[PDB]
Amino acid sequence: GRVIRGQRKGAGSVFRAHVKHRKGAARLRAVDFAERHGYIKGIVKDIIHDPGRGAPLAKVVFRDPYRFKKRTELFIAAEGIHTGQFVYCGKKAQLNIGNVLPVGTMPEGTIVCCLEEKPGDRGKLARASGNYATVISHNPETKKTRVKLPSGSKKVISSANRAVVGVVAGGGRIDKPILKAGRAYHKYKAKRNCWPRVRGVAMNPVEHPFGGGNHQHIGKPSTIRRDAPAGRKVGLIAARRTGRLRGTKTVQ
Amino acid sequence: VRPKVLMRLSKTKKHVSRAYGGSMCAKCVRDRIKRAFLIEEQKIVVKVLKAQAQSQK
Amino acid sequence: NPLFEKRPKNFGIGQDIQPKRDLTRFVKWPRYIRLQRQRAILYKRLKVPPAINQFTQALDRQTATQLLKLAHKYRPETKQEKKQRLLARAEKKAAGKGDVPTKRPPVLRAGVNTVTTLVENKKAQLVVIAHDVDPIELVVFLPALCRKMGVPYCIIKGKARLGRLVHRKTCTTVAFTQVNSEDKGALAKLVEAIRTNYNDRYDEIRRHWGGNVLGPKSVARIAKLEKAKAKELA
Amino acid sequence: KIRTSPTFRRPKTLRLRRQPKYPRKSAPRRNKLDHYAIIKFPLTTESAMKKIEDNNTLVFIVDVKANKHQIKQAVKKLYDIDVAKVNTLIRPDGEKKAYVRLAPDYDALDVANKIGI
RNA sequence: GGCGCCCUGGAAUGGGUUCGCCCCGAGAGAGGGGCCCGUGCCUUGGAAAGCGUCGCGGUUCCGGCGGCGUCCGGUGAGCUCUCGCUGGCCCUUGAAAAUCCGGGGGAGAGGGUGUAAAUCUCGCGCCGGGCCGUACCCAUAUCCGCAGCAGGUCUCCAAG
RNA sequence: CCGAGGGGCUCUCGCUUCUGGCGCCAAGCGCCCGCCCGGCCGGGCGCGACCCGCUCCGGGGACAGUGCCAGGUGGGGAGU
Ligand SMILES: [Mg+2]
């Protein structure tokens, strides 16, 4: 009768993110005349740390073409950039590390982070630490390129999706074990309220579909359909298979 | 001192007699002066070496 | 002469600040502006029925100038001159008791509810009709109705302009019922110059649909495909 | 005309001055808190007595809506004395007490004699 | 006390240094400077007031009256506080704004001289600073628990 | 393409990449008034900074959505 933990996360009273000490939205600069038709010069001033993000950020200042003013962006910092470095941005930008330029101009097999999934979106795909995307297969007519997402999914995008050359800094972060319960506490204290996760088997029938019984067992099959209502989608959701893996995935 | 006590002071205990007085550190002043000279001078050199390429091609 | 020097400003990408140019297209207008502009486009983009497309074919300005000259001296009574006329009839009625002093005061009628009764009774002799009536259905029957009752009509530009003839803001229709006899040859001179273009063409002006033209940014890329297709042959 | 900004901000129009053709309340109301309503009575306790000759301060009880400027003018005008400083207080019955110090040209122990006490 | 400030000058037979480190041809050691904190001392305040002691007046307001003293050093893993330097730890990186200052620019402004202007964040002098809170308990008896209830209830100072 | 002092079946764009500097509030040229008897001031406009146009620019797009109806599913929940 009682609603369950998975349903209470959507209202967001104690389940909102912890967004105070973060430094801002890490977005590529919004497109204008300069990045459509040439390049604009920018210098990176510092390399900073968001709480809850394992990628470092870089703050890059740009001479404004219209106002006598300088203005500061926040980039997903590609790996191997340093402070006091010139970052160039636009169509006629040269393919070096850390530069950001359209995917229709960089050649095939290049390694790309922080790419737009639609033109103007200012960077959405492959933003976490260690991640990158590869471009393959340009199509000059009906201008559209495909890329390889870090999940192995190939996806066709626009030709003019603006994207920064290289791989995200901070890679290898999941090679060190958390190794004790306290360092998982500090890991999620900066992100959300989700970490001490009670198994649904170990609770009462009001609180979960799997709870109850004089033994800790599930009782019902752990795989649920996808049109199952909110309050029943627990366990393996709409699974195509189960058990320990045979092959890598062998299914599109 | 604190920011609001700086309102009581006079601009002799608040800056230094150089250019970029109470802002810059006097060794990056020294480098900004050299950096502005040495690369505006090459924008004469790369200008005029470009200017002798149309006249002798 | 001695020291004054040229010092130009490079305005390419990555040089001096772009100067304050026009920018009158790329300006975020209020939503009463772009509602007002997007529907002027949207009468050019949808297929307009020929009943609305009776209009946009108005009189050319040499004909509207002769027509407003003819309609000028038939100007109606206003309230300043309504005072002294009720003197001038009655001050002589106090002095001579005329059985009929005035045989015919002529005037041009105004008002769609007035002109409509004149046309179907065939009392009107020329029907100037406006251009930009806000609910277009207030007027749209009347070019179809002037044809059947044989009364000549003509579309003029601006419901504000013939509204100034009647000392008002808009008046949407005027009609000529009783013109002067000595000036009938100025009213009858322009009627065949009018009823050529409106009454006699009604078998054709009722077929002619309007609208249905694409924008210039999209009718260019249709032509850029066709210029490729003319190079695909030759 | 050219529009050097991408923004349409609404034009500065004219704003008239309110000059009505009848007053809404027909008469300025008189100040209820004038200089007799300021200062009710003087305080004549033992602690108020020995602050007169030892300190050149005479103590009153004032209406609670009076600031120390109104008290300074409503004692200078009623009792014809120069006022140095005033120290007010809300004493916990709910009435405001003022400690009005006089100029050294004056004395308090004789000004208190001509105001009754 | 601190300096990641400057000048001379150039270092291997490498040297200088810490409790630990660390530092040096991108300039060590050595020599001479410069800046910051100066909560310590002296001085002005300021001895006139405070305390200690001795003695005499004054019924009474008496912030009476007089004498003398308030002096030398030493030491510390001491305790508490503070300022400063230096490490370590983090899949943890440890607030915002109000306010205030400095710099870059150079639109302008100013008297025109054997005289003084614009300006002054310099030294003085002038006037003002309104409204509200302030007592006391802060608890094995002034709070909550029906009560002068072994309960509960946030802190600061701390000797041999 | 040919060829002759050149023509333009066909075309590209272009004016910032060794470096932790700087960049705005127009120079210049062209004109015009009040101002100097063919000389002196104080102002204004254009080109510099191309013309026209019907959506701010892109991405979708008669789909997705939304309104009503129908059929599945539905201990998520309701009543017994
Ligand atoms: Mg668990």
Short mmCIF file of C-alpha atoms (C1' of nucleotides) in Angstrom, two decimals, chain E residues 68-122:
data_model
loop_
_atom_site.label_atom_id
_atom_site.label_comp_id
_atom_site.label_asym_id
_atom_site.label_seq_id
_atom_site.Cartn_x
_atom_site.Cartn_y
_atom_site.Cartn_z
"C1'" C E 68 55.80 56.29 50.59
"C1'" G E 69 55.73 52.19 47.14
"C1'" U E 70 53.98 50.23 42.22
"C1'" C E 71 61.42 47.23 41.54
"C1'" C E 72 64.98 43.63 39.06
"C1'" G E 73 65.98 39.15 36.55
"C1'" G E 74 65.87 34.01 34.91
"C1'" U E 75 63.73 29.73 32.51
"C1'" G E 76 60.26 26.15 29.56
"C1'" A E 77 58.57 19.90 24.32
"C1'" G E 78 54.76 23.86 30.40
"C1'" C E 79 49.15 25.00 29.53
"C1'" U E 80 45.62 28.35 26.71
"C1'" C E 81 45.13 31.76 22.73
"C1'" U E 82 47.18 33.85 18.46
"C1'" C E 83 50.16 34.94 14.07
"C1'" G E 84 53.29 32.63 10.54
"C1'" C E 85 55.79 28.75 7.84
"C1'" U E 86 55.71 23.86 6.02
"C1'" G E 87 53.79 19.01 4.80
"C1'" G E 88 49.87 15.32 4.45
"C1'" C E 89 44.52 13.54 2.88
"C1'" C E 90 40.44 13.45 -0.95
"C1'" C E 91 36.63 9.01 -7.15
"C1'" U E 92 35.53 14.44 -0.51
"C1'" U E 93 38.60 20.03 -3.38
"C1'" G E 94 36.07 22.39 1.17
"C1'" A E 95 29.72 29.30 -0.21
"C1'" A E 96 27.39 33.55 -2.36
"C1'" A E 97 26.32 38.58 -2.71
"C1'" A E 98 26.38 43.58 -0.61
"C1'" U E 99 30.18 46.72 -0.31
"C1'" C E 100 35.26 48.69 -1.23
"C1'" C E 101 39.99 49.43 -3.84
"C1'" G E 102 43.73 49.38 -7.61
"C1'" G E 103 45.15 49.32 -12.60
"C1'" G E 104 44.48 49.81 -18.31
"C1'" G E 105 42.73 53.49 -21.24
"C1'" G E 106 42.33 58.98 -22.56
"C1'" A E 107 36.67 61.55 -24.06
"C1'" G E 108 37.81 66.03 -21.74
"C1'" A E 109 39.12 69.99 -18.41
"C1'" G E 110 42.26 74.30 -16.97
"C1'" G E 111 45.08 79.77 -16.18
"C1'" G E 112 47.80 81.46 -19.73
"C1'" U E 113 52.65 83.74 -16.80
"C1'" G E 114 57.52 87.04 -15.31
"C1'" U E 115 50.61 85.81 -12.36
"C1'" A E 116 47.39 82.41 -10.90
"C1'" A E 117 43.86 78.83 -12.62
"C1'" A E 118 41.08 73.96 -13.03
"C1'" U E 119 41.89 69.80 -9.48
"C1'" C E 120 43.91 67.46 -4.41
"C1'" U E 121 42.64 60.01 -1.87
"C1'" C E 122 47.43 66.11 2.21
#
